Design a protein around this ligand. Structure first.
Ligand SMILES: Nc1ncnc2c1ncn2[C@@H]1O[C@H](COP(=O)(O)OC(=O)Cc2ccccc2)[C@@H](O)[C@H]1O
Ligand SMILES: Nc1ncnc2c1ncn2[C@@H]1O[C@H](COP(=O)(O)OC(=O)Cc2ccccc2)[C@@H](O)[C@H]1O
Ligand SMILES: [K+]
Ligand SMILES: [K+]
Ligand SMILES: [Mg+2]
Ligand SMILES: [Mg+2]
Lengths: 433, 432
């Protein structure tokens, strides 16, 4: 429409694809090196120059980037263009109170829309389909990324965003979307609300669900597909690389997300040593962007554990199950949360010692985050019961506001959280299984 | 950058503008009549036909449309193209539990981006400026309309959306926007938060504030301009017509929103008789779209009371103060709320009689919505205090969810709300 068709590159030969990748990879390395002081330093210190890349395998010579490099160059230090050529910024959780920040040229936004349209098409969406977009609109990459891709595909986009459960179901009923884009966790909430409204979940217009932003199981898939009468497809990404639409599953094979590696070049490494592993081996997923202008990323470590699998329905490889992470990051209802994020907010309250413990659990199918924090000892003496309840509320509101997750808060006497014999607490107890 | 400069039509002659309007009006009326059964019907019933329009003055022959017509044709009954050619819907409060729903073709989106870019440019914005967009992103037209306009103009858009007050100020501090787009009420919240963070409001990077979605005073303008060190400009619109970017003020003259009447054709009428009034005269603003494909609107009554003023900085006319409305609609923090909307949610709870009263008040500079409802008599006798407090919280949450506004809720005994001698209550007491 024109976007009903596959792009030529989607069905290109392995040779054609690898030639394109090599030509873009040379450009992207040199773009990074010339235009981003950090990469100039980081390459120089590693003894490597862009010229050193003669073949795809030569990528292993180049250093890794991580979340720390963004943190150390906040807010815009990793831009490879002047800010006056940057039309979009997006923001998500960092390890400190400064968000992780990414920027995009006009071309970058166009590229993003194109791969996100490609993803929705791979999953079976078409021009003219009504599409219910329940990913968060705003600083998160999910909502706006899915928005542009769907609009580029010629879908009728319902910009629902991520809350208002009764209204979600009202509009699914009234607007009759064929496609829903939503976290897998919130999809379950929506099914529950259909039931409470007297709507059998299989009596909906939906034929396709495209789920991402967090891991989900085969069992969740079977449960959604069966109850709602849809094909459910897996859409992957992360803000640093672009957003959603880094990889997406094809409905013809349903055999895991296809990585759009004409744009986003994947490697798998041992998470401990950093050595590159052969395709089929489980390790940590690393990306190098091939077409990004504003913020090229070079061997960016996702911390996601997975594996690369051979091409099937496309010219490109696939991801295996994403089985966890190699850092301490939590995802709650699609929202990235670091324990250190919470710590910073906890310590900011002068009545609290800084001692804290997050317990994650499952209440039915819903994740629950519960936060215990300790008073300073001098404070137990003087803080009233009403004062410590308000302290709990205030802490809950700041975490909701600054991190973006809802949490139960409990305020304990000093020593109230079980510690090592010298006072060290386990920061995260995840019982969600 | 292809959006730094004015468009030719912006400084065209009045003759040339009116000739474009007439041609586009002929097209719009016929597009509506040919393709929307509703309009076929209302035109026919009014004894008029698109051919009947031979000059701009002939528009007064055509019937008005209103929110009711959207209500009666929900969700998509006023589309003039197949739904498969519509790429966007947006939704805002109706008088019922069904939202007011509007649709756009790909071309429509492009047209809307163009007039919103033009608006932000009029207010002094330029390609390369960092713009902090704090209008709500989602079903509201505000967030996404401003988004596409600012992107089109080549601003660095920060897609902040409407909440998270501490984070708003953190990112204004850190990202150093030159432009903020936000409701005028929420701008005041933001200034308070600056103070609480130990930031003097005048030590921001901001140079331009573009405020709308609701009426604001000269006094609010003076306060914001003084305290923040900016020029504040007024941007107007409504979802049925397109969104924000129907009209916007020029920083050159700061004499009220310029109507982009190459796209949106204004009339002022007496809100009682429907008679068209001469420019300079106070009445009700009525729009007819000139370029819209998916949902052409013909003589749509905004219910906004204002006047048309002569051109100054552009070829196009300006709006006077928007002084109020000719219906019972409320706006709280940019969110449209109908009393009938609230009634529908109240009546849905089977313990409650349906008797209700909204009190609006000003808590400092902040609007409060406070809602009293009555139990049915048989229920007072039997509902505990815990249950009745839970009822209040549930009503509060359903109003927040379905209407989009926060409110205090009180649950009273039957007759607890002052009524007429035969039990009619005043629905709205606006003390703001
Ligand atoms: N399909 C998925 N399966 C498993 N994990 C996922 C999946 N999608 C994203 N994640 C996790 O979340 C991260 C990035 O979170 P971030 O907030 O940066 O970006 C958005 O989650 C972008 C997104 C939005 C909508 C759909 C898909 C992707 C990644 O490193 C994974 O750990
Ligand atoms: N600048 C303003 N001055 C006074 N009232 C305004 C102004 N802007 C809009 N209103 C009121 O809000 C309605 C429409 O509400 P609705 O939600 O459909 O559309 C968005 O308020 C669109 C908007 C978004 C952001 C900025 C400006 C305009 C309109 O009929 C007026 O009563
Ligand atoms: K995520
Ligand atoms: K409004
Ligand atoms: Mg179904
Ligand atoms: Mg200033």
């Amino acid at each position: 429409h024109p976007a009903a068709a596959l792009e030529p590159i989607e069905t290109a030969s392995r040779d054609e694809l690898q030639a394109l990748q090599l030509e873009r990879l040379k450009w992207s390395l040199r773009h990074a090196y010339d235009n981003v002081p950090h990469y100039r330093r980081t390459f120089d210190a590693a003894g490597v120059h862009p010229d050193d890349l003669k073949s795809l395998a030569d990528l292993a010579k180049f250093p890794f980037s991580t979340k720390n490099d963004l943190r150390d160059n906040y807010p815009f230090g990793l831009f490879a263009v002047p800010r006056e050529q940057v039309v979009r910024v997006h923001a998500s959780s960092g390890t400190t109170g400064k968000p992780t920040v990414v920027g995009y040229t006009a071309r970058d936004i166009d590229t993003w829309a194109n791969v996100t349209a490609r993803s929705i098409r791979a999953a079976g969406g078409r021009p003219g389909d009504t599409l219910h977009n329940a990913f968060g609109y705003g600083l998160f990459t999910g909502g706006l990324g899915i928005h542009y891709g769907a609009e580029r595909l010629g879908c009728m986009v319902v910009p629902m965003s991520g809350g208002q459960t009764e209204k979600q179901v009202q509009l699914i009923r009234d607007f009759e979307p064929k496609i829903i884009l939503v976290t897998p966790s919130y999809m379950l909430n929506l099914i529950d609300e259909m039931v409470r409204q007297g709507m059998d979940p299989a009596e909906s217009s939906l034929k396709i669900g495209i789920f991402g932003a967090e891991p989900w199981t085969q069992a969740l898939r079977n449960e959604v597909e069966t109850r709602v009468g849809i094909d459910a497809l897996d859409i992957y990404g992360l803000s640093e690389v672009m957003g959603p639409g880094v990889a997406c599953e094809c409905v013809e094979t349903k055999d895991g997300p296809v990585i759009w590696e004409d744009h986003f070049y994947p490697e798998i490494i041992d998470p401990v040593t950093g050595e590159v592993l052969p395709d089929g081996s489980q390790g940590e997923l690393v990306f190098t962007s091939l077409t990004k202008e504003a913020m090229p990323v070079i061997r960016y470590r996702t911390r996601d554990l997975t594996a690369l699998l051979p091409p099937t329905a496309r010219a490109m490889r696939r991801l295996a199950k994403i089985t966890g992470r190699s850092d301490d990051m939590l995802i709650v209802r699609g929202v990235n949360v670091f324990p250190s994020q919470i710590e910073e907010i906890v310590v900011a309250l002068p009545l609290l010692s800084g001692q804290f413990q997050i317990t994650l659990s499952r209440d039915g199918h819903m994740d629950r985050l519960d936060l215990a924090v300790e008073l300073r000892s001098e404070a137990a003496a003087s803080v009233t019961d009403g004062e410590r309840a308000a302290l709990a509320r205030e802490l809950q509101h700041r975490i909701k506001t600054m991190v973006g997750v809802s949490s139960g808060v409990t305020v304990l006497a000093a020593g109230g959280i079980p510690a090592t014999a010298t006072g060290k607490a386990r920061r995260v107890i995840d019982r969600r299984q």
